[PDB]
Design a protein around this nucleic acid. Structure first.
Ligand SMILES: [Cl-]
Ligand SMILES: [Cl-]
Ligand SMILES: [Cl-]
Ligand SMILES: [Cl-]
Ligand SMILES: [Mg+2]
Ligand SMILES: [Mg+2]
Ligand code: NA
Ligand code: NA
Ligand code: NA
Length: 326
DNA sequence: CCGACGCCGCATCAGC
DNA sequence: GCTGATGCGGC
DNA sequence: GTCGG
């Protein structure tokens, strides 16, 4: 937490630019600088020192000098006082309410948690579940609970079909002591990039987890991505566990390594890696790494037998999941 | 200076 | 109904 | 907002 003051400041600026300004590149600029500063192994003593890092330019250097001199940022101090900006930032904390819906709700004088409850019929299904579990979804998940949740999902997936393989990704696979939600990558040999030999491969898993009352709500659901809500069972007389967000991603089995690279993250690690892939003349998604022809259009998928092969193609030394927490 | 900034599944809506 | 654009959230 | 060419 060596430069937590600075990185917190940059994260709040990033959220402002995303949520209020709707300037996504500024959002990504602030988050990149927050990321490079967060892994910097010295207590930053000036904006000039920070400007030496990639992603910190003149404007952020100046903000860091202001913050180091005073402990505050006038720009953020003004943003916190503006009622419209703080209302928009609040509403975007509801899953399913993004920058556009948040500004629309504010325009209708729907600006508080009480306002949202009073107007639940103006919400789509995603938003209604995000409001229902608003408090729960902002709690973090201790890794001990992640371990219990892992055991349920893997055992229940095994009961459906022992040929499924379920892998918990996200921050859990990076070794985090707590996670914001649970990310599950799913494969089954009937689903490859070559053919889908069995229908309902994700649905059957989802229904099994609902049947045993682990999955409690559904935000969205298609043939390959499920996003919903789950809950650990609690013991007699004990308070219930918080409800938790769970994402399940069914990936073609022959594309597992690209999929587990993507689902392990972090999000900034994936942006940096895919950006560097482009500079090396490749494009990476959760399925494939493909070369870029001279015209810059993706060619055919390159063979991939491990996460490290992907690293090898773009001339990066391998980084274990726990070193990907950017 | 200026273009480029990672890549995509699902939900929802406009237009046909 | 379909196709395309947009919003949103995922890493 | 930052950066590479
Ligand atoms: Cl922008
Ligand atoms: Cl501040
Ligand atoms: Cl792969
Ligand atoms: Cl692909
Ligand atoms: Mg996660
Ligand atoms: Mg996340
Ligand atoms: Na810099
Ligand atoms: Na939101
Ligand atoms: Na997730």
């Amino acid at each position: 937490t060596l430069n937590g003051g600075i990185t917190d400041m940059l994260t709040e600026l990033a959220n402002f630019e995303k949520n209020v300004s709707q300037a996504i590149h500024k959002y990504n600029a602030y988050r990149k600088a927050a990321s490079v500063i967060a892994k910097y192994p010295h207590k930053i003593k000036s904006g000039a020192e920070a400007k030496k890092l990639p992603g910190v330019g003149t404007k952020i250097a100046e903000k860091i000098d202001e913050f180091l001199a005073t402990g505050k940022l006038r720009k953020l101090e003004k943003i916190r006082q503006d009622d419209t900006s703080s209302s928009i930032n609040f509403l975007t904390r509801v899953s399913g309410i993004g920058p556009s819906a948040a500004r629309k709700f504010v325009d209708e004088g729907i600006k508080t948690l009480e306002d949202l409850r009073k107007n639940e019929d103006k919400l789509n299904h995603h938003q209604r579940i995000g409001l229902k579990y608003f408090g729960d979804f902002e709690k973090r998940i201790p890794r001990e609970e992640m371990l219990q949740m892992q055991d349920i999902v893997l055992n229940e997936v095994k009961k459906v079909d022992s040929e499924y393989i379920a892998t918990v990704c996200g921050s859990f696979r990076r070794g985090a002591e707590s996670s914001g939600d649970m990310d599950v990558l799913l494969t089954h040999p009937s689903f490859t990039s070559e053919s889908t030999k069995q229908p309902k491969l994700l649905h059957q898993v989802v229904e099994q987890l609902q049947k045993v009352h682990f999955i409690t709500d559904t935000l969205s659901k298609g043939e390959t991505k499920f996003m919903g809500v789950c809950q650990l069972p609690s013991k007699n007389d004990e308070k219930e566990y918080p409800h938790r967000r769970i994402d399940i991603r069914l990936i073609p089995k022959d594309q597992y390594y690209c999929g587990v690279l993507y689902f392990t993250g972090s999000d900034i690690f994936n942006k940096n890696m895919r950006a560097h892939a482009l500079e090396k003349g490749f494009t990476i998604n959760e399925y494939t790494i493909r070369p870029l022809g001279v015209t810059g259009v993706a060619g055919e998928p390159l063979p991939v037998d491990s996460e490290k092969d992907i690293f090898d193609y773009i001339q990066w030394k391998y980084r274990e999941p726990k070193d990907r927490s950017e």
